[PDB]
Design a protein around this ligand. Structure first.
Ligand SMILES: C[C@H](NC(=O)c1ccccc1C(F)(F)F)c1nnc(SCCOc2ccc(F)cc2)n1C
Ligand SMILES: C[C@H](NC(=O)c1ccccc1C(F)(F)F)c1nnc(SCCOc2ccc(F)cc2)n1C
Lengths: 302, 302
């Protein structure tokens, strides 16, 4: 029974590592780890290094394809390779993305590898209040998807620079005047929630040369979300300038109630209605277990 | 203002022809022309030959990409290149597809180029009657899209053969027992209506290495449809075995009434609600004028 997919387990996948150096020290790993994440050097080696090898093979071949079009066109720093990383809140895709960026940037030919999270493209709160969308922050309509598409297009067009706006998780809002400048990289990783989504018109997913989806049982992500929420009381919420400082004095059980409620009404439905439906398109799915461990992968060979 | 697209006119596009031989005689052209079509050798040269050049550049480069994945995978007749041709009924995509197939098969390296129309994947009439779908023949739900996806996947998987069922336009139904065998080509052109469409799960559009969309003003396609309908009275409908023989004795004005009605209730809405929304994804759009002439094109350079 023929398939566009190939399943692996860590045993099979780790084998595919070949002679790929490990250029990442333990000090550096944890400086990319997010609160709650269990990723160790043994996982970089056995999972992210094959992945990095795969990606670097394809970067070369993917550009030949743009060569062909430019040769047709009778034409005279290539077309940036674009990676998308998607997944639910709290699944740890943010970390994956940051790890991936460090692994790729340390290829001996030394490419420039920018990383942009989509949260800088959320509408500011006042704009969200206007549209009646606060209660749906993180859903697709709470993003300026036109702005976001222009940006990625602009970068891939080979343009000299592009700017993105900047979100502050501290203040739960877009930072006035702040901007992230992306000066023509070789690779761009774009990380967000529904970034793999498909539409009537053309969308960023269409621009992706490679894409990555970080998966887990829905019960387990709830678990990680709630724990991280509780942990955030002595972290992010502890700062008296946090938009969410009021949460710092919640007890374990109020905190679990609040966390569960946000999860039930905002984060779970977005996952189910929007994010999860996009899994089938992803070049690679990283499947995590309850203990955070990546033990199965699903690659698109077609 | 940067764009994924490049517009052309026939002047600009024809220039891109380079030294591409014309291996198609006028006898052979018209034997592919459909009732009403105005395509002449001057259009093959100035439009289909650039197109053929473009396609043959990309076939080479697109396979390097599957090489990269197989080299990663540590692996030991390549992965068939898959072209999709979409557009409304009566726009003449059927012809384009057949022309394209003849132009590609006569490349000096002599590749096998199969062509499959999607109509063989319509549900038989009795199955359509069951689902209450006769009045929506040609809409996406009147196709066995699972069967269709299995097929294209099977071919691209590199499998030795795949079978498709066969529709009879004469009898307005699927022919019992008939089958079209596709024995591992180098290129497969797949022609149909919503074939460029996108979904929750993975679909044929995802398997396309190249895609082609044949466009025209909606008023003009109505015009061509109605004329062809009238013309079909002394052609297809003239055969007393035609499911539609009753139409042969319609006068011009009854015939125009019938044709307009079918167009209003079945073919126009499908075009508007489903087909036309898919135009943005197509690698190349062929834009035809009221006189049938291809005078502008839109290529995806990203
Ligand atoms: C609906 C809202 N979503 C977001 O703020 C959001 C939107 C887009 C991208 C990322 C987030 C994020 F991660 F949660 F901050 C939200 N979801 N949880 C909260 S409470 C703030 C605590 O933030 C987190 C973030 C991540 C966790 F794993 C646990 C708690 N809020 C305000
Ligand atoms: C709704 C139905 N659609 C189809 O049969 C159909 C479905 C899928 C693919 C192609 C067709 C096709 F082209 F019209 F035969 C239909 N549309 N017009 C008719 S009348 C039969 C006359 O066929 C045509 C076909 C094409 C024309 F340009 C003009 C008349 N019928 C029965």
């Amino acid at each position: 029974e023929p398939s566009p997919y190939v399943e692996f387990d860590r045993r099979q996948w780790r084998a595919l590592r070949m002679s790929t150096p490990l250029a990442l020290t333990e000090e550096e790993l944890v400086g990319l780890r997010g609160l709650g994440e269990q990723i160790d050097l043994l996982e970089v080696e056995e999972v992210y290094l094959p992945l990095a090898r795969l990606i670097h093979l394809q970067v070369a071949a993917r550009q030949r394809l743009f060569a062909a079009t430019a040769e047709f066109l009778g034409e005279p720093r290539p077309v940036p390779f674009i990676i998308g990383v998607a997944g639910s809140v709290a699944v740890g895709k943010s970390t994956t993305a940051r790890v991936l960026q460090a692994l790729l940037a340390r290829w001996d030919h030394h490419p420039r590898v920018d990383l942009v999270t989509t949260d800088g493209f959320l509408y500011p709160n006042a704009e969200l209040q206007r549209r009646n969308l606060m209660h749906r922050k993180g859903f697709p309509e709470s993003y300026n998807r036109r702005a976001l598409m222009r940006f990625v297009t602009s970068v891939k067009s080979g343009s000299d620079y592009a700017c993105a706006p900047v979100y502050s998780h501290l203040h739960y809002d877009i930072i006035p005047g702040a901007e992230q400048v992306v000066r023509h990289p070789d690779i761009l990783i774009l990380e967000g929630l529904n970034v793999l989504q498909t539409g009537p018109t053309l969308m960023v997913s269409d621009l992706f040369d490679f894409s990555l989806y970080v998966d887990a049982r829905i019960e387990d992500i709830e678990q990680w979300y709630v724990s991280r929420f509780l942990a955030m009381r002595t972290t992010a919420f502890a700062d008296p300038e946090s938009h969410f400082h009021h949460y710092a004095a919640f007890s374990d059980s109020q905190a679990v109630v609040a966390a569960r409620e946000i999860w039930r009404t905002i984060n779970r439905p977005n996952l189910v209605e929007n994010i999860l439906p996009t899994r089938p398109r992803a070049t690679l799915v990283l499947r995590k277990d309850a203990d955070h461990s990546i033990n199965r992968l699903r690659l698109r060979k077609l």
